Amino acid sequence: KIRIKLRGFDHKTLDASAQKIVEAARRSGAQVSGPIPLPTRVRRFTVIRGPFKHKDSREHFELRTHNRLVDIINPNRKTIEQLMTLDLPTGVEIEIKTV
Amino acid sequence: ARIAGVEIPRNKRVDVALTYIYGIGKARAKEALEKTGINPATRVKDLTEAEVVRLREYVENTWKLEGELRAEVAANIKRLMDIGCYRGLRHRRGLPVRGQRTRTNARTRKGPRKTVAGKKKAPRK
Amino acid sequence: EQYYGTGRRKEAVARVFLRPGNGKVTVNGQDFNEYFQGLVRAVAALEPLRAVDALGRFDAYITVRGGGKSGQIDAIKLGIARALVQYNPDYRAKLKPLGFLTRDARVVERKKYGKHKARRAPQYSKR
Amino acid sequence: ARRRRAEVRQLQPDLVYGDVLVTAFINKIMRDGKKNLAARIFYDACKIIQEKTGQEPLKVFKQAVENVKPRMEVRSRRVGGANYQVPMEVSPRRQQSLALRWLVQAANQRPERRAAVRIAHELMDAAEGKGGAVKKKEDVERMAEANRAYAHYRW
Amino acid sequence: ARKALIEKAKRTPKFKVRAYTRCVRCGRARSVYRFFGLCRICLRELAHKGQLPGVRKASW
Amino acid sequence: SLKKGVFVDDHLLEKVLELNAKGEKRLIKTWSRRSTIVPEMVGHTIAVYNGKQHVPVYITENMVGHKLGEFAPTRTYRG
RNA sequence: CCGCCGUUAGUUGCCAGCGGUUCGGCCGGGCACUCUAACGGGACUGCCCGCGAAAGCGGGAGGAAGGAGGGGACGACGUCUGGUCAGCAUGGCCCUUACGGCCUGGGCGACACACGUGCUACAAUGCCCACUACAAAGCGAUGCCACCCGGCAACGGGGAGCUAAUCGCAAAAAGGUGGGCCCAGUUCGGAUUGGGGUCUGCAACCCGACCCCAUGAAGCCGGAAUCGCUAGUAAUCGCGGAUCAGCCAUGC
């Protein structure tokens, strides 16, 4: 019944936040449907290499937003307690809901 | 089979056939070809008075064509050529009222581009 | 019961189920010979069943999403290949020399900044 | 090239009979990349040939293609500040290919209105020889056997 | 003029249709990728100098 | 274009409707040229700006509800 | 990034396998398959044979992958006082109630020609109206805007869902499947032209896009010359994003 989405720019750590949760949650309760990866939406940007009227000569840059999704079963007090308390995203965005 | 302005289309499907007349494009044509009967597909070939004559009645009683239609144009052109507006200004100057291109193109509106002389060019090399 | 293969070509993909029966084939709904009433490559894609002349013994059921009509066709071929090269890899012996597994290439390449179709370049002046 | 002798790359092993010849023809007929459309035009032409003439399609195909297939052409060579109209025998593939082209543009020359008509007509009268494509064949054969003074004056 | 121009829009005048974006890390309106509130040269100086998250010297 | 309505401006309005309180002097001095010509201006010496100076244009009928600053040239020099 | 396989993982996908159904993944169920997006393995002339002293080359196979697999970012030492003081900083010279600042107007769109990159074309492998098809990527909260309705339309009034793999932009188009045109300045091509409409915005004259219906030029496939492109490349066809009230975007 739990809808936890994790939006991330560093896919390395962002995934590390995806399985971690699942351990202690599969631990402090019952099943926790696997972290399931979700379409890393990417915002395409680009511009030219310099300042002066140089139509060619360009560099592309884009935003890598990886989506994560954890579903847990019927929650428990330990689970909810620690796994709403402890964290260290240091940036990464954590948004949950009751669907 | 003169209808208006001595205009007879001859062998050709009635739609495009009457389309061959000024004052009538695809719309006003097919429109007429319902509001006076007449099958759009069926050619001008085996036509028959009543419906041809009445097509012609639909032409004039409803809207105008040819001479007056262009007289209207030119007279309101005179409306642009009675004060001296930009429209009329460049209507005289041989130029379009769209303020777009007067630098290069617009040769649709003042004959072939008749060479100046080149005037000799800057440091182009 | 199930003799399945995977198809995928020119950015498209076909879930190639093949059971047996009368060897008649229909895919993604509509009858095969109406789904693709365009390109002649149609029957050509069904070459592997015509490689052993067993065109009508194995019942295929394919799910091809993406690419185009022809791309679909490509992935279909790919799978009909892979499926008979599973539930009888005896058919693999005489199908690679025939080239029924080399997947694909093709990509309308990443458009080159500066040129058009990543190759197509603007008319060069010099002057 | 210069450090290489290049690549040939197989043509479509035909989806109809199986003849690469047919797909080469189809391709030359094809315009703007829609292989299927023009291919259809050809096939229509074919079934017409075999609802009209006796001998089967690929037969008419071979007798026409053969009734072009030019061997000795002209090319060019270096001479200080001039040119050598070098008559030379052509590689079989080049012969056959350009020949196919000549079938196509022979369908071009025509005052024909529909495509299948042009292609069919040509394949018929060129299986025969009554065509501008064979005319230009023996024309490049004049060119060859009329610049033949440049026999061993090849590049 | 320049200095006065940034101030012109910095304080929203009369009509909605007289605002124009401004590179607050260089100071112009031309090609200011509004998403970042940065011009194109300001954009590249930021992303390059490592002072811009979420990006990537893209290689797709 | 105003789809439902016709754009004009109130400078002219207040002005015209106050000389209409009598029918006085044969001059008005307007700076707006974006405005649509109206028939209640009667149409004497509507002195409009151009880009360099105010240049009086006459107004009667056929300039009905079409824009003012159109009978003020601006685009000087011809061809 | 892209092609083959794997393990984690299952609100994308599905009878693939079962139940039912408003038979429309629609209702339960399931991770098989697509997919998603992660962590690796996989290709080195490694194997086989003939040649070369070797470097390499020929032929064949194993394999999704051959001999650098396709692409991308990647660009030295250096030149060229290249380009840029109008993005920025910047040494100096310089106006300082004027070269500073605001406002409203007007130009940056002007026209006797010339030129580069371009869109469209000049036509039956085509133009036109009807039915069905397969796209990939990128978007959308004071924005995406399906729906009925008013309007032929431009779009407007009431109105669903949507911090999106679940809602909408959105119809891909050519393909295919029917019917029309019959070789013609043509149902070609719309360049331009008039009397009216929609939308944004204080405001659409200069100088906006878009709608209507009437206008319907040149254009019969381009001389000297000259450009592109070596594989899913060219040619053809549609699609999005950037910035943006709007839109001159046929540009990128």
From Swiss-Prot, chain B:
GO MF: rRNA binding; structural constituent of ribosome; tRNA binding
Top-level division of the source organism's lineage: Bacteria
Signal peptide: none
Record GO cellular component, one term: cytosol
Region annotated Disordered, chain positions: 94-125
Gene3D superfamilies, A to Z: 1.10.8.50, 30s ribosomal protein s13, domain 2 (4.10.910.10)
Keyword tRNA processing: no
Pfam families listed in its UniProt record: Ribosomal_S13
This protein's record includes keyword tRNA-binding: yes
Annotated keywords: Ribonucleoprotein, Ribosomal protein, RNA-binding, rRNA-binding, tRNA-binding
Matching InterPro entries: Rbsml_uS13_C, Ribosomal_uS13, Ribosomal_uS13-like_H2TH, Ribosomal_uS13_bac-type, Ribosomal_uS13_CS
GO biological process, alphabetically ordered: translation
Family: Belongs to the universal ribosomal protein uS13 family.
Quaternary context: Part of the 30S ribosomal subunit. Forms a loose heterodimer with protein S19. Forms two bridges to the 50S subunit in the 70S ribosome.
UniProt function note: Located at the top of the head of the 30S subunit, it contacts several helices of the 16S rRNA. In the 70S ribosome it contacts the 23S rRNA (bridge B1a) and protein L5 of the 50S subunit (bridge B1b), connecting the 2 subunits; these bridges are implicated in subunit movement. Contacts the tRNAs in the A and P-sites.
HAMAP family the UniProt entry points to: Ribosomal_uS13
PANTHER family assigned to the protein according to its UniProt record, in alphabetical order: 30S RIBOSOMAL PROTEIN S13/40S RIBOSOMAL PROTEIN S18, SMALL RIBOSOMAL SUBUNIT PROTEIN US13M
Protein name as catalogued: Small ribosomal subunit protein uS13
Organism: Thermus thermophilus (strain ATCC BAA-163 / DSM 7039 / HB27)
From Swiss-Prot, chain D:
Stated family: Belongs to the universal ribosomal protein uS7 family.
Keywords of this entry: Ribonucleoprotein, Ribosomal protein, RNA-binding, rRNA-binding, tRNA-binding
GO terms of biological process kind: translation
Alphabetized HAMAP family for the sequence: Ribosomal_uS7_B (MF_00480_B)
GO MF entries: rRNA binding; structural constituent of ribosome; tRNA binding
Protein name: Small ribosomal subunit protein uS7
Gene3D superfamilies found in the cross-reference section: Ribosomal protein S7 domain (1.10.455.10)
NCBIfam families referenced in this protein's UniProt entry, alphabetically: rpsG_bact
Any Gene Ontology CC annotation: small ribosomal subunit
PANTHER family per record: RIBOSOMAL PROTEIN S7
Top-rank taxon: Bacteria
InterPro entries noted in UniProt: Ribosomal_uS7, Ribosomal_uS7_bac/org-type, Ribosomal_uS7_CS, Ribosomal_uS7_dom, Ribosomal_uS7_dom_sf
Functional summary from the UniProt entry: One of the primary rRNA binding proteins, it binds directly to 16S rRNA where it nucleates assembly of the head domain of the 30S subunit. Is located at the subunit interface close to the decoding center, probably blocks exit of the E-site tRNA.
SUBUNIT field: Part of the 30S ribosomal subunit. Contacts proteins S9 and S11.
Taxonomy of the source species: Bacteria, Thermotogati, Deinococcota, Deinococci, Thermales
Curated annotation (Swiss-Prot), chain E:
Pfam families per record: Ribosomal_S14
InterPro entries the record matches: Ribosomal_uS14, Ribosomal_uS14_bact, Ribosomal_uS14_CS, Ribosomal_uS14_sf
Cofactor annotation remark: Binds 1 zinc ion per subunit.
Gene: rpsZ
Keyword presence, Oxidoreductase: no
Function, in words: Binds 16S rRNA, required for the assembly of 30S particles and may also be responsible for determining the conformation of the 16S rRNA at the A site.
Domain of life assignment: Bacteria
GO BP term (any one): translation
Cofactor: Zn(2+)
Similarity-based family: Belongs to the universal ribosomal protein uS14 family. Zinc-binding uS14 subfamily.
Binding site for Zn(2+): 23, 26, 39, 42
Any one cellular-component term (Gene Ontology): small ribosomal subunit
UniProt key word Ribosomal protein: yes
Quaternary structure note: Part of the 30S ribosomal subunit. Contacts proteins S3 and S10.
UniProtKB keywords: Metal-binding, Ribonucleoprotein, Ribosomal protein, RNA-binding, rRNA-binding, Zinc
GO MF annotation terms: rRNA binding; structural constituent of ribosome; zinc ion binding
Entry protein name: Small ribosomal subunit protein uS14
Curated annotation (Swiss-Prot), chain F:
Designated gene of the protein: rpsS
UniProt record similarity statement: Belongs to the universal ribosomal protein uS19 family.
Residues of the full protein shown: 4 to 82 of 93
A GO term for molecular function: structural constituent of ribosome
Lineage, broadest ranks: Bacteria, Thermotogati, Deinococcota, Deinococci, Thermales
A single BP term in Gene Ontology: ribosomal small subunit assembly
Source domain of life: Bacteria
Function in brief: Protein S19 forms a complex with S13 that binds strongly to the 16S ribosomal RNA.
GO cellular component: cytoplasm; small ribosomal subunit
Protein name: Small ribosomal subunit protein uS19
Entry keywords, A to Z: Ribonucleoprotein, Ribosomal protein, RNA-binding, rRNA-binding
